[PDB]
Amino acid sequence: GPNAVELTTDQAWCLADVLGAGSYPWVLAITPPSAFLAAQSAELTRMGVVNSAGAVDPRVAQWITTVCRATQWLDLRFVSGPGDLLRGMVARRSEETVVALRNAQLVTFTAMDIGHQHALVPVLTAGLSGRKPARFDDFALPAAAGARADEQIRNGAPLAEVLEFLGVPPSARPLVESVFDGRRTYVEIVAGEHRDGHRVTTEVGVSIIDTPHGRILVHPTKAFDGEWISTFTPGSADAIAMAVERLTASLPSGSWF
After folding, report:
1. How many other C-beta atoms lie within 10 A of the C-beta of residue 240?
2. Spatial distance between the Cα atoms of 41 and 60, rounded to a whole number of angstroms
3. CB of 73 closer than 8 Å to CB of 120
4. In the beta sheet, which residues pair with residue 104?
5. What percent helix, strand, coil does the chain show, rounded to 5?
6. CA dihedral sign, ordered 52, 55, 57, 60
7. 35-43, Cβ contacts within 8 angstroms, sequence gap of 24 or more
8. In a 3-state reduction of DSSP, which class is residue 256?
9. What are the start-end ranges of the H helices in 47-136?
10. Which residues, 6 or more positions from 133, have their beta carbon under 8 angstroms from its beta carbon?
C-alpha cells in the first residue's frame, strides 16, 4: 500500500546495509545471506524500491531506520506449529510508529498511526488462531514459577508433573491445562527502550494464548520486593490493550500514551 511495503529477508538485509542504519534487531532474526549487492538491485529498481539513480525510496528508508534505531519497541515472538518462523516488531523512533512483521522468508514493513492502545491489538494477535476470549475467574501465580513451568513443557515434561510443580488447584486445573496444551498458538510480547545511554528491556513479557478454552492473556505485575506476579485473565481486546499499555509503563520512559 501507500504506507506499507513487502520484501524478502535478503532484500531487507541489503537495504539495511546500503543505508547504514545498523543491523536488524535479533527478534526478527535477519541472517546475513558484491555478486549479490548489485544482483538484487535489479529487482529493487524494478519494484520501485530504488530509483534508476540507485537511491532508496525516501521513507522506505525511514522505516528501516526506525526499526533499526528504535527508541521504543515491542518484540513479538509468535509461535505456531514447528517449522514456522513468524516474528514481529512494533518500532517507534521520534514519533512515527513502524510495524515489522517477518513470515518465512518474507518481511512486511508498515507505518501506523498509533495514538490508541487498542490500535495495536490486531497486530499482536495476527499470528494466532482467532479464538474468542475465554471465560473464567482471574488467578495469579509467581511469574518465575510460570516461566519455569513453561520451559519444562517445551522440554517434554509430562503435563501432570508441571501442574503439581505449580500447585494448581482443581478450580483452575482445566484452565492451566489449556494454557500448556500442545495444540496452542501464542505470542510473547517484550517491551524495551533506549534512554540516558541505556538499553532497558522488560524482564517479564505479556503472553496472548489461543487455547481450547479460548484466548487467554497473561500479564505481569511487580511486587515491592521486586518479584513479579503473572495474572491469568480472559484475553479480550481491552485486557490486551491494557496489558501492553501497563507493560510499557513499567519502563523508565513510561507508557506510550
Report:
1. 25
2. 15
3. no
4. none
5. 30, 30, 35
6. positive
7. 36/10, 40/10, 40/11, 40/14, 41/14, 43/11
8. coil
9. 58-68, 121-124
10. 214, 215, 234, 235, 236, 239
Ranges of each domain in the chain: 1-257
Cα dihedral 206/211/216/219 (nearest 10)? -20
For residues 29 and 87, the answer to whether their CB atoms sit within 8 Å is yes
Resolution (A): 2.7
Paired with 232 in beta bridges are: 139, 218
What are the counts of helices (DSSP H) followed by strands (DSSP E) for the chain? 8, 11
Question: Considering only CA atoms, which of 218, 160, 158 is closest in space to residue 188?
Answer: 218
**C-alpha separations of 94 from 65, 132, 146 in Å:** 11, 35, 36
Q: Phi, psi (5° rounding) for residue 102? A: -100, 125
Determine contact, residues 11/44, Cβ cutoff 8 Å: yes
**Owner of C-alpha cell 511486587:** 223
Name the experiment that determined this structure.
X-ray
Query: Which amino acid does the sequence have at 229?
Result: I
- CA-to-CA dists, residue 252 to 77, 95, 255, angstroms: 23, 17, 9
Specify the DSSP class assigned to residue 120: G
Q: Are 247 and 219 in contact (CB under 8 A)?
A: yes
> For residue 133, which amino acid is it?
P
Structural element, H or E, at residue 177:
helix 173-179
